[PDB]
CSV table of C-alpha atoms and ligand atoms in Angstrom, one decimal:
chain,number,residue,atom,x,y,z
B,1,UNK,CA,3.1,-5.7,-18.4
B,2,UNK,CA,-0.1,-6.4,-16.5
B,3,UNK,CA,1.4,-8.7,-13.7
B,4,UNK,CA,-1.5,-11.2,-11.4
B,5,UNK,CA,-2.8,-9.6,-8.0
B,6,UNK,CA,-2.3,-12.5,-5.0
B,7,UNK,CA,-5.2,-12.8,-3.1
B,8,UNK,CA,-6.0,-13.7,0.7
B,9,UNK,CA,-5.8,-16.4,1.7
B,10,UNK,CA,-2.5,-16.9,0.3
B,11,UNK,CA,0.4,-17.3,2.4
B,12,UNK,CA,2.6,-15.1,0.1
B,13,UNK,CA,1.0,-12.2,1.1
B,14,UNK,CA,2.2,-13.0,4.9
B,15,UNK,CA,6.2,-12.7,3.6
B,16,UNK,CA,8.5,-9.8,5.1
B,17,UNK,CA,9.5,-8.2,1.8
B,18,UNK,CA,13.3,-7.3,1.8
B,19,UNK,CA,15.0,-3.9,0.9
B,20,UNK,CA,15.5,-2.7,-2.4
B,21,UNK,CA,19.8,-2.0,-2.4
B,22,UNK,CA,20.2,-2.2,-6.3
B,23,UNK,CA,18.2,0.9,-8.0
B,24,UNK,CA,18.2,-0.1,-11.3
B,25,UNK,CA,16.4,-0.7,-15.0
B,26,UNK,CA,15.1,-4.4,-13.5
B,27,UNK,CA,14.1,-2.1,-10.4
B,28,UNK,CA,12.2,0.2,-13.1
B,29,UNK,CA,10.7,-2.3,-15.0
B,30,UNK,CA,9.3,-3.7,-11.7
B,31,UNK,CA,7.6,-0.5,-10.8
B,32,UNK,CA,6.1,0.5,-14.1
B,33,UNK,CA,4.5,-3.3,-14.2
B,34,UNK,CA,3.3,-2.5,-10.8
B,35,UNK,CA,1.9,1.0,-11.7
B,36,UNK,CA,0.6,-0.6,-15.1
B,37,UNK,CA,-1.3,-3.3,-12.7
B,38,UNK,CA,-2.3,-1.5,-10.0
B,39,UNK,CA,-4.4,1.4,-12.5
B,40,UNK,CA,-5.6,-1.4,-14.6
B,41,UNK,CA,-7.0,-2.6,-11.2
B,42,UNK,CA,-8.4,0.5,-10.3
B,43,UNK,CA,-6.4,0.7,-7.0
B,44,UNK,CA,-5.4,3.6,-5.5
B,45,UNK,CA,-1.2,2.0,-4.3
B,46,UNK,CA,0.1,-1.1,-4.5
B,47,UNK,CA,2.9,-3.2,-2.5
B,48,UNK,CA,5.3,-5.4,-4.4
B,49,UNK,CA,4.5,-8.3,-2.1
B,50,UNK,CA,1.0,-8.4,-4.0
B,51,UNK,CA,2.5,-8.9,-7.4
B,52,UNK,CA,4.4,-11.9,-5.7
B,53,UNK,CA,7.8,-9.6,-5.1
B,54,UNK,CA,8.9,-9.4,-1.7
B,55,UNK,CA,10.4,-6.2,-2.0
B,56,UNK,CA,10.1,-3.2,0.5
B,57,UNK,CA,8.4,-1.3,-2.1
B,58,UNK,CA,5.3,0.2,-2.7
B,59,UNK,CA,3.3,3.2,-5.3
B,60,UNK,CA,0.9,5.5,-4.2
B,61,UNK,CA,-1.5,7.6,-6.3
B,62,UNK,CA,-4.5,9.4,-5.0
B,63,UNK,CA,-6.9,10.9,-8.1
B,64,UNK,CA,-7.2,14.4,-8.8
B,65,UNK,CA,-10.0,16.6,-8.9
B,66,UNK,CA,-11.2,15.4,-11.8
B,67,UNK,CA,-11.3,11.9,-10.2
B,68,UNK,CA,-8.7,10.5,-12.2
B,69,UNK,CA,-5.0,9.5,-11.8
B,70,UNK,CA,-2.6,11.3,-13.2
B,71,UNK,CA,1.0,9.4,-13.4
B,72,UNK,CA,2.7,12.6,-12.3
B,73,UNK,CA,1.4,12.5,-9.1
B,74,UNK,CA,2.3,8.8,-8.3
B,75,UNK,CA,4.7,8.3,-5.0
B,76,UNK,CA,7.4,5.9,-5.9
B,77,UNK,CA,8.1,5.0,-2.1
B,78,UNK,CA,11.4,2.3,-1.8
B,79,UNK,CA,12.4,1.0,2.1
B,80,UNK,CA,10.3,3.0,3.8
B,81,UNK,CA,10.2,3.8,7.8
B,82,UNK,CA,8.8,5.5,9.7
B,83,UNK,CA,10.0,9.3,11.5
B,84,UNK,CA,6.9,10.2,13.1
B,85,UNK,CA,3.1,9.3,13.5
B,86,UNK,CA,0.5,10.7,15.7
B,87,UNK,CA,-3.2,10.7,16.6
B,88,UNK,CA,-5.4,7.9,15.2
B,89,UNK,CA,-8.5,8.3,12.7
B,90,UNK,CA,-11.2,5.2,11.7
B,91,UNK,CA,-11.0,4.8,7.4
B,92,UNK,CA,-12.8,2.8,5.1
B,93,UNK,CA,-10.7,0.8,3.4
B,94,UNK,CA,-10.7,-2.1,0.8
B,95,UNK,CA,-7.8,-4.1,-0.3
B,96,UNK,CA,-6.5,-5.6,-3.9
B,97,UNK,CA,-5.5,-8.5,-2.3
B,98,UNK,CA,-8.8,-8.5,-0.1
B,99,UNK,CA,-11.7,-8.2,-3.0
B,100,UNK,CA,-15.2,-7.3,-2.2
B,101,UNK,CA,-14.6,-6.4,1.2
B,102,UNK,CA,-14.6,-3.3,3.3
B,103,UNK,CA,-14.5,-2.1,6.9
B,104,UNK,CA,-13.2,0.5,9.2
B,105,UNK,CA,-9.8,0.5,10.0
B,106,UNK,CA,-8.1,2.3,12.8
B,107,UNK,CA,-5.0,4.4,11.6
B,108,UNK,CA,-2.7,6.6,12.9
B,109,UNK,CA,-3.4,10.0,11.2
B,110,UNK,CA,-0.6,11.5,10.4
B,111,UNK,CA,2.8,10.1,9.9
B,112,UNK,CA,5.8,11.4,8.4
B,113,UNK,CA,8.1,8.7,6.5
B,114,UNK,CA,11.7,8.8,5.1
B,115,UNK,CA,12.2,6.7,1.9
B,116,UNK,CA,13.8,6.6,-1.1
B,117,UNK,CA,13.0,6.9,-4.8
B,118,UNK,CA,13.1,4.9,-7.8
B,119,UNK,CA,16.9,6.9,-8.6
B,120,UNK,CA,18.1,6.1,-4.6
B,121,UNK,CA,17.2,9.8,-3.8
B,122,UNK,CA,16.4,9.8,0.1
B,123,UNK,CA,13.1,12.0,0.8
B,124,UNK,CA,11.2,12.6,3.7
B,125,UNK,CA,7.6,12.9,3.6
B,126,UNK,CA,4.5,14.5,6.0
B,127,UNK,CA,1.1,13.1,5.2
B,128,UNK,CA,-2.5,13.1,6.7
B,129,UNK,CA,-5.8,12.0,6.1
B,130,UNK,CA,-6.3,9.6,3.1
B,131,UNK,CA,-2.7,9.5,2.4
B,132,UNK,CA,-1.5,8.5,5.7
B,133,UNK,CA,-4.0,6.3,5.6
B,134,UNK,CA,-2.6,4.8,1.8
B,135,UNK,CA,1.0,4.8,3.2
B,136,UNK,CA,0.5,2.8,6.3
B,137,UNK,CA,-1.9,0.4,4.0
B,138,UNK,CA,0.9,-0.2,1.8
B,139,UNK,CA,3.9,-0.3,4.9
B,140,UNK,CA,1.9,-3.1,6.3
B,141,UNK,CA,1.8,-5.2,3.6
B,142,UNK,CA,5.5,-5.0,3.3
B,143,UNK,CA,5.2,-6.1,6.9
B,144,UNK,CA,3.3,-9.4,5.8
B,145,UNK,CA,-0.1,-7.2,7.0
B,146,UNK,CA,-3.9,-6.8,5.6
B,147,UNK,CA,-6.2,-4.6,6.8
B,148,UNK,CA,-8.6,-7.1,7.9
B,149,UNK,CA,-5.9,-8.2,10.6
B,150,UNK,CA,-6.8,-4.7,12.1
B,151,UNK,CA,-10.0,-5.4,13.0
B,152,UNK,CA,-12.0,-5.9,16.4
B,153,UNK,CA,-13.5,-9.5,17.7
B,154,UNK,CA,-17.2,-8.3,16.3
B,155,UNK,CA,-15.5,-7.0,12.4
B,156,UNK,CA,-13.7,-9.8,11.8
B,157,UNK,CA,-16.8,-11.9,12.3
B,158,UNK,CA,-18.3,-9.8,9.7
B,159,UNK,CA,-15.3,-10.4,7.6
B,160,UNK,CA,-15.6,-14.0,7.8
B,161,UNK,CA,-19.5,-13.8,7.5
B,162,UNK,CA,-18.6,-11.9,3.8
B,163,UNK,CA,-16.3,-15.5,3.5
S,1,BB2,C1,-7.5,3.4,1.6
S,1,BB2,C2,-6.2,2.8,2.0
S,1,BB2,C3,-5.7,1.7,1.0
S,1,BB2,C4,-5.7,2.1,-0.4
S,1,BB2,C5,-5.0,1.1,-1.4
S,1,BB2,C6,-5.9,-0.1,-1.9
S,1,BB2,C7,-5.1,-0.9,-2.9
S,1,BB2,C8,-4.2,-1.9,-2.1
S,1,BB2,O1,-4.7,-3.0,-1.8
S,1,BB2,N1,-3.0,-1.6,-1.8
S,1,BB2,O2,-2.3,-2.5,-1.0
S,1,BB2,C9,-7.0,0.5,-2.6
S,1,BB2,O3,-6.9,1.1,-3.6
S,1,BB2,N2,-8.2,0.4,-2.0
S,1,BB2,C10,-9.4,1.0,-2.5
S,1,BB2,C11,-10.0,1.8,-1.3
S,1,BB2,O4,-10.0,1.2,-0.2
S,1,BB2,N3,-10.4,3.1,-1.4
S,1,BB2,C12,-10.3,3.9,-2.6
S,1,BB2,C13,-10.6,5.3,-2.2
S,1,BB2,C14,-10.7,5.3,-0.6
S,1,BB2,C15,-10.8,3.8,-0.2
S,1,BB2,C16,-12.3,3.4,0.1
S,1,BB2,O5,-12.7,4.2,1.2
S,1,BB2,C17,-10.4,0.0,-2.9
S,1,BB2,C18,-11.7,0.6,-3.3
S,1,BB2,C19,-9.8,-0.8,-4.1
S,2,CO,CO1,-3.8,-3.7,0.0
């Protein structure tokens, strides 16, 4: 199912999601509408919290080569924390719940994360570069976060200039 993206300024989107303890079909069903939504979207991840579930919970899926996304390389990332993060790197970045705006966003760049998957499976990840910068997108949001909270005195004018 196609499910409705919340947008700022909604106070939804300000929630600490919860963690995920049951890993189940309802669990499934959740994160195939969310992958379903999230491509019909054109995003590149998603956080439950934008779909109006305040779970700790969140997909990932960079394109290929090709420039497309292929479903076998989507991250499935449940409760998330962080191990390890180092350095810091400026991205461009847009948000779902943000549309038609984009500015430069410090991150850290790289992190490495332990999660687990959609069967409970614990995994520990390394990432850099545009997927460290996708991760700590999505961890934010489940942290009641947007990008645009990230940005300096003169950027945020710009942000509400563009508002
Ligand atoms: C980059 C870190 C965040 C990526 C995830 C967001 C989607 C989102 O709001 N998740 O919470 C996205 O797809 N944003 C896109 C985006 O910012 N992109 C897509 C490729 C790289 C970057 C633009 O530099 C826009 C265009 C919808
Ligand atoms: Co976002």
């Amino acid at each position: 199912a196609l499910l409705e993206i919340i947008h700022y300024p909604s106070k939804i989107l300000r929630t600490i999601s919860k963690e995920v303890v049951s890993f189940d079909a309802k669990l499934h069903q959740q994160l195939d509408d969310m992958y379903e939504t999230m491509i019909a979207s054109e995003g590149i991840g998603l956080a439950a919290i934008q779909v109006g579930l305040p779970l700790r919970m969140l997909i990932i899926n960079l394109p290929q080569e090709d420039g497309v996304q292929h479903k076998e390389d989507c991250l499935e990332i449940i409760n998330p924390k962080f191990i390890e993060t180092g350095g810091s790197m400026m991205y461009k970045e847009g948000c779902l719940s943000v549309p038609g705006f984009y500015e430069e966003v410090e991150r850290f760049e790289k992190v490495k994360i332990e999660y687990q998957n959609r069967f409970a499976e614990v995994k520990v990840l390394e990432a850099s570069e545009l997927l460290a910068v996708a991760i700590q997108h999505e961890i934010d949001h489940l942290n009641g976060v947007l990008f645009v909270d990230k940005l300096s005195i003169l950027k945020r004018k710009k942000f509400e200039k563009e508002l």
